[PDB]
């Protein structure tokens, strides 16, 4: 009824009648508490009196007077006292409710606790830790584990994300689900990287794991050791298929950097040349070549439409690439023999750069780009004006990037031997061009001089290479020396180019760059902050830094230059990547500004995260951004449109249409500028880059900064022109086609039923063609065929149908590569 | 017929916010009821279970719904037998609904349970429910429902006598927002009144004043008759007359009578009409509890008599003050005035000797403290209802887009003509 | 929401006084207001005015 | 529940959702306005 | 369900503190 008596006996001695007082009033608290409420002071002194032995009861009492109250940690510590009057199996919303708020103080202690170290001790009450544990417990016998690992996700406890489960049951969905949710979550990668050990270690228990799982997870450690491991076990489960598609996990994901470990351990771990011959991925050259040459969709009549459609300097610049882009890898001079008075029409960087283009159309060809620039290359003279003669230069490593380091240190030495103008310029691109994300001090250094000769023309290039040298955690010293250029070299552009080779050089590093980054920030210059937020970027690509975009935001808000926020809000989109979900969201304010800039930024960003992806609504934001009065701005948004539209045509989305029209409308438009055809016209060209066939891929798993690049190489381009081309680099293969072991190519359309988008792609079965990153996953392999894979089906680019009796029938197949390669 | 907008009302389950709609016309949707038209839920519908319940007295988130309709026909049909047991049966399944929904529903709910209840087995077995699930809907974060529980326990403190109880029961509750702003008045109205029972009037003066703005208006009458009654008293107990405006506003007039026959008594600071008038309308007074609150006045009676004498008469022998306020002796004079200096009331001196009271000026004329004072309180006044008035004031926004495109081309190809001439 | 204002109207009471006035249930207000009080004083007054002269006359 | 009711003391976060909301017709104002 | 959810929402409560805190900035940025 009343506590009266209960709040009287409290007092009364005999701890005899305070327990029974405590009892009786344990049963009756839950509602009398509220006159107890006063009592508790007592109540306090009674848990402090261990004379009288139940006083757990009162802690507990109060506890239940606390949520009664609303306090916890009080009533969590008094039921913590408890014990006894507490257990977990008490069923009450209270005991339920008490509980879950006891645990939630243990994730941030064990958090705070896991912040400085991470494992077992005794710093969190055990109590709690037991409860937990016990609820874990009870989490493991809920048996359910995401229940039980998400928390220990949290909980940071291996002990109890041990192998319990493993054993248990679920043998293929217990970890990736985790594992790719950790990749997805934990802040600090160490404990997530920690899984990724045990998780492999979890597969390497092995009744034979998926390894493209591992390698992803390899590939997110990058420890080669693990690949290593796995090759011995590879090697101990030796299959070529196994090693191939292990291979083809491989080729497809390493960094240059990583890999080349591998390759040389892989060499020193002996075999199967295979697998250093798939280390080539020429095989993809080849293929993507052969996929192109074959599959191929071209109509440069509408090209030609769009070439034979004006005629100017600037403009004319551009269709020297859209062409590029139809041929990228393609290799052929179809409107190059077209208009030789283009060439005429050409200026010299124009000459540099349809010198240049022809990288684009020969890439993948590893052997003739050479000699393809060969008339065009150095020494071997030329019609006219060093820069095509430079052109080559840069035009060169656009096939060989990473793989013409000879020849680039062979013409680094024409660089050495003499740093300047186009003749160092052109050279000074192509350098880091393949010399990226390989670290050659003389790329850096040999650029440092050409970059300190400081001829606009020239140095610029260095201010790139030696960020694309070093792009990685790169040196600090260079970052000084470049942030000291920076500050130091007095140009615009020599300046400029700087922060960008520090973007470069900051690639991942995110916390580590931050101070050049506030530094960056803190610059006077827009400069250095432009590059800044490329340097975030790079540093906080993919995954979302909140901070770091709430950083490049408020910096994109709090700064004076618009480019800068241009840029900040570009560059967003790369650390926005990961989720382009909310970036039409996002943009959805910068989408409405007063400012074009901002308008502009806002263009890429969101065109770069879906680049490879849907969301016709974040497309459909675009098309009024598409009419903003400045073409500046359309040209952007008409780019940033393309960039997501290639393969996504044709009713599919049938705004292509229009967007399409509206390039040409524009392109038919002599009203709209050489800003606006420009675009259009490349925007065209990019949906029909490699033969309108190919498609444009970033961390869609995991990243490749090659993708990346071109991105920020032709974010500035109006700026400086000839650039782009590097785009060339996340054109991606919708290559489908049989490969194998001994290679016989054996073509079969595998026939699944996608709703039929190999039939949605512009106007002028199974095996190659459009697919699409999905209509390859609605189609799955027969297994009638001779051939099978181990991991059933798979992306369009990787392609690779496994084999499962030679020199008989299934017959004979070739291609540009079994003629050559 | 009519149950059509029952069958209308069931159009209202499809989610979410439509409930609250749903209940509005609900509200109303109780003028028609037939025995036989509940057969109606019986062909509308667990649903055997359903039937059996109808036949005794006489989809799920519409169960609920329905089931008040079936609360609503039996308290409203006054028989309290079947009504009573059907609650005990209709309140448990609905209760223990595990549904966030019907949290809502069961409001209107057990603002019937407790109201037709009468005794221990409904205040005491009843309010331990009203609690319990207080603290489970509470951490179920359901506004409406926590708040309309809340006001019903508070409800049961104040039939019985315990103020302090709900007093401390306020001290470790937090209040939450979404509210109905009548229930928020019943809230306010409560509350007011328990922080003056404690004697604190300063602070009831303003949760009263709430449940009077809070307080909607069409002919929610009796709730307004009442707490102004409470309203006079706590005006008047603070030591501020009301104004006459108040005795006569509305069909109330005639409730406020005894309040309008006590500030005449206490006005003119005569203790024995005071007196007689409390024994004269007591009875009446007693029908509230407003009754032991008017009966401290007989304090502030002799304040105002004192102060009367004061401002009138320059110095008195307490002779005359004695007469005037018909006392008994001197001695008990200047205990009376001699308390009510301390008090800041008169500003006077005693001559003790000659026993007369002589009396402090008005030096303090403009004090300009005290002006200040109610101007600045003032002045947040008007700004907050400035800033109110600019954070909701502030919210059909859409439809923006101004310039153009194919204008914009027609004023470049106005340009290009322009160049060429 | 006037449907639940007068539930709280109910709840909060019937009442006995309130249905009556409720029944009775007009007139104007004229313009402000305070201290009405009794009356028959004035001519009281005079009539001990008077008297109280009278009295005094008396006197 | 433990984690089970949790998703909902979190979800009904989208009162930040509407202000904002406020905010973008109350922002995009001004941008009509500045434009 | 929840590890996928419960968690994948987080980000949201940031999206409305990515938002929130940028929205006053085009309120503050316009009105200079």
Redesign the interface.
């Known amino acids: 009824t009343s506590a009266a008596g209960i709040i009287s006996l409290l007092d009364e001695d005999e701890p005899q009648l305070k327990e029974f007082a405590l009892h009786k009033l344990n049963a009756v608290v839950n509602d009398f508490w509220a006159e107890i409420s006063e009592s508790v002071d007592k109540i306090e002194v009674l848990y402090e009196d261990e004379g009288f032995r139940s006083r757990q009861f009162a802690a507990l009492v109060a506890s239940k007077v606390f949520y009664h109250l609303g306090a916890f940690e009080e009533s969590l510590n008094y039921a913590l006292g408890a014990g006894d009057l507490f257990n977990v199996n008490d069923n009450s919303e209270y005991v339920e409710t008490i509980i879950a708020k006891c645990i939630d103080h243990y994730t941030k202690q064990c958090v705070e606790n896991a912040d400085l170290p991470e494992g077992e001790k005794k710093p969190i009450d055990q109590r709690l830790e037991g409860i937990v544990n016990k609820m874990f417990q009870r989490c493991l016998d809920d048996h359910k584990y995401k229940q039980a690992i998400g928390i220990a996700l949290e909980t940071r406890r291996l002990d109890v994300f041990e192998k319990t489960i493993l054993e248990s049951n679920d043998v293929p969905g217990m970890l990736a689900y985790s594992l790719k949710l950790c990749m997805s979550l934990m802040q600090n990668k160490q404990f997530r990287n920690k899984v990724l050990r045990v998780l492999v270690k979890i597969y390497m228990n092995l009744e034979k794991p998926d390894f493209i799982n591992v390698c992803q997870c390899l590939i997110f450690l990058d420890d080669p050791q693990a690949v290593s491991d796995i090759l011995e076990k590879l090697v101990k489960e030796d299959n070529l298929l196994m090693a191939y598609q292990i291979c083809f996990d491989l080729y497809e994901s390493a960094s240059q950097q990583f890999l080349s470990s591998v390759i040389q351990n892989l060499r020193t771990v002996g075999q199967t040349l295979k697998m250093i011959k798939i280390l080539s991925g020429e095989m993809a050259i080849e293929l993507h070549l052969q996929f192109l040459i074959r599959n191929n969709n071209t109509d440069l009549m509408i090209l030609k439409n769009t070439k034979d459609a004006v005629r100017n300097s600037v403009c004319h610049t551009a269709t020297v690439i859209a062409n590029s882009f139809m041929h990228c890898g393609t290799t052929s001079d179809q409107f190059l023999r077209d208009n030789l008075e283009w060439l005429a029409r050409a200026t010299n960087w124009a000459k540099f750069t349809a010198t240049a283009s022809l990288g684009v159309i020969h890439k993948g060809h590893e052997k003739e780009a050479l000699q393809l620039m060969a008339t065009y290359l150095p020494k071997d003279t030329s019609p006219g004006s060093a820069y095509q003669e430079g052109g080559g230069l840069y035009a060169l490593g656009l096939i060989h990037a990473n793989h013409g380091g000879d020849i680039i240190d062979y013409l680094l030495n024409q660089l050495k031997n003499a740093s300047n103008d186009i003749v160092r310029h052109g050279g000074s691109l192509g350098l880091g061009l393949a010399a990226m994300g390989t670290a050659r001090q003389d790329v850096y250094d040999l650029l440092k001089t050409n970059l300190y000769q400081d001829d606009a023309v020239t140095g610029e290039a260095a201010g790139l290479a030696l960020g694309l040298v070093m792009l990685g955690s790169k040196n600090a010293q260079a970052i000084e020396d470049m942030v000291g250029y920076a500050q130091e070299t007095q140009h615009e552009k020599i300046l400029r180019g700087l922060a960008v080779g520090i973007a470069l050089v900051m690639y991942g590093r995110m916390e580590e760059a931050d101070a050049l980054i506030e530094s960056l920030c803190r610059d006077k210059d827009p400069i250095l902050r432009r590059s800044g937020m490329y340097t975030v970027a790079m540093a906080y690509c993919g995954s979302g830094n909140n901070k770091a975009i709430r950083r490049l935001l408020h910096v994109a808000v709090s700064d004076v230059n618009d480019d800068v926020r241009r840029a900040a809000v570009e560059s967003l989109g790369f650390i926005l990547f990961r989720t382009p979900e909310q970036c039409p969201s996002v943009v959805s304010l910068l989408s409405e500004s007063y400012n074009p800039h901002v308008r502009y930024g806002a263009a890429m960003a969101l065109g770069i995260c879906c680049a490879g992806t849907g969301n016709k609504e974040a497309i459909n934001l675009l098309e009024p951004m598409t009419n903003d009065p400045v073409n500046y701005v359309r040209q952007g948004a008409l780019i940033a449109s393309a960039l997501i539209m290639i393969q996504q045509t044709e009713i599919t989305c049938p705004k292509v249409n229009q967007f399409r029209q509206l390039y040409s409308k524009v392109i038919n438009d002599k009203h709209d500028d050489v800003m606006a055809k420009f675009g259009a016209i490349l925007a065209q060209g990019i949906l029909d880059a490699g033969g309108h066939n190919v498609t444009i891929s970033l961390q869609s798993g995991h990243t490749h900064m090659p993708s990346v690049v071109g991105v920020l190489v032709f974010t500035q381009f109006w700026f400086w022109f000839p650039l782009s081309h590097f785009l060339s680099l996340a054109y991606t293969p919708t290559c489908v086609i049989g490969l194998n072991k001994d290679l016989k190519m054996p073509k079969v359309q595998y026939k699944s039923n996608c709703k039929p988008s190999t039939f949605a792609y512009p106007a002028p079965l199974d095996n190659p063609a459009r697919v699409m990153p999905a209509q390859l996953k609605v189609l799955t392999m027969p297994e009638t065929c001779r051939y099978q894979p181990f991991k059933p089906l798979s992306i369009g680019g990787i392609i690779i149908l496994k084999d499962t009796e030679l020199v008989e029938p299934v017959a004979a197949h070739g291609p540009k590569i079994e003629e050559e390669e | 017929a009519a149950a059509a907008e029952h069958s209308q009302r069931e159009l209202d389950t499809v989610t979410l916010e439509d409930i609250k709609e749903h209940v509005k016309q609900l509200e109303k949707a109780v003028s028609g009821k037939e025995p036989r038209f509940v057969l109606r839920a019986l062909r509308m519908l667990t649903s055997r279970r359903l039937n059996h319940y109808v036949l005794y007295k006489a989809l799920p988130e519409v169960e609920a719904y329905l089931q008040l309709l079936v609360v609503i026909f039996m308290m409203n049909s006054k028989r309290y037998k079947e009504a009573q047991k059907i609650s005990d049966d209709l309140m448990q399944k609905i209760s223990t609904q595990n549904r966030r929904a019907l949290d809502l529903v069961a409001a209107k709910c057990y603002y019937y349970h407790a109201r037709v209840y009468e005794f221990l087995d409904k205040l005491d077995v009843v309010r331990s429910f009203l609690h319990a699930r207080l603290r489970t809907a509470t951490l179920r974060h359901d506004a409406d429902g926590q708040a309309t529980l809340l006001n019903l326990l508070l409800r049961n403190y104040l039939h019985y006598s315990l103020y302090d109880q709900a007093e401390k029961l306020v001290s470790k509750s937090v209040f939450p927002e979404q509210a109905n702003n009548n229930e928020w008045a019943r809230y306010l109205y409560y509350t007011g009144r328990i922080k003056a029972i404690q004697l604190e009037y300063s602070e009831a003066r303003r949760t009263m004043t709430n449940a009077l703005r809070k307080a909607p208006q069409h002919t929610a009458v009796g709730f307004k008759q009442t707490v102004h009654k409470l309203l006079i008293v706590v005006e008047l107990l603070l030591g501020e007359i009301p104004d006459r405006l108040q005795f006569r506003q509305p069909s109330l007039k005639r409730s406020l009578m005894p309040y309008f026959l006590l500030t005449q008594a206490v006005r003119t600071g005569n203790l024995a009409k005071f007196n007689q008038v409390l024994d004269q309308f007591g009875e009446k007074f007693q029908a509230d509890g407003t009754y032991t609150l008017i009966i401290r006045l007989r304090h502030n009676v002799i304040k105002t008599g004192v102060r009367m004498i004061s401002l009138s008469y320059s110095r008195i022998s307490l002779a005359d003050i004695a007469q005037k306020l018909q006392l008994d002796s001197p001695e008990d004079a200047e205990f009376i005035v001699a308390k009510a200096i301390r008090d800041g009331v008169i500003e006077a001196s005693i001559n003790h000797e000659k026993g007369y009271v002589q009396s402090k000026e008005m030096i303090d004329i403009y004090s300009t403290r005290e002006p200040q004072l109610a101007f600045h309180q003032r002045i947040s006044f008007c700004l907050d209802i400035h800033n109110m008035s600019v954070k909701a004031m502030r919210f059909s926004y859409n439809k923006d887009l101004e310039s153009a495109e194919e204008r914009r081309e027609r004023e470049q190809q106005d340009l290009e003509f322009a160049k060429e001439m | 929401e006037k449907k639940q204002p007068v539930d709280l109207g109910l709840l909060e009471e019937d009442d006995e006084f309130e249905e009556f006035p409720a029944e009775d249930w007009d007139a104007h207000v004229w313009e402000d207001n305070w201290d009405d009080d009794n009356v028959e004083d004035d001519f009281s007054n005079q009539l001990r005015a008077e008297l109280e002269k009278h009295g005094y006359k008396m006197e | 529940?433990?984690?089970?009711?949790?998703?909902?003391?979190?979800?009904?976060?989208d009162k930040?959702?509407n202000?904002?909301r406020?905010?973008?017709?109350?922002?995009?104002?001004?941008?009509?306005?500045?434009? | 369900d929840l590890y996928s959810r419960y968690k994948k929402l987080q980000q949201e409560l940031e999206f409305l503190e990515v938002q929130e805190e940028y929205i006053k900035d085009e309120q503050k940025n316009l009105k200079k």
């Open positions: 529940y433990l984690s089970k009711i949790e998703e909902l003391q979190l979800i009904v976060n930040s959702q202000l904002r406020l905010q973008a017709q109350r922002n995009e104002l001004n941008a009509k306005v500045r434009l």
